[PDB]
Amino acid sequence: GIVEQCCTSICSLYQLENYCN
Amino acid sequence: FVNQHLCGSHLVEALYLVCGERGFFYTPKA
Numbered sequence A: 001g002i003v004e005q006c007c008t009s010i011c012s013l014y015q016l017e018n019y020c021n
Numbered sequence B: 001f002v003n004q005h006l007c008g009s010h011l012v013e014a015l016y017l018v019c020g021e022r023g024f025f026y027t028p029k030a
Helices: A002-006 A013-019 B009-022
Strands: none
Touching: A002 A013, A002 B009, A013 B009
């Protein structure tokens, strides 16, 4: 999930926008 | 501000800035 991609590992603008409505 | 380790309120804050008026969904257990 988002925690695995952005918290435990370095986040990115690409991944963050995957969770926008 | 997006290219780092983002956890908890720091992560929700990032989603807020990035997604804007579109809004977002935060699912830490999914």
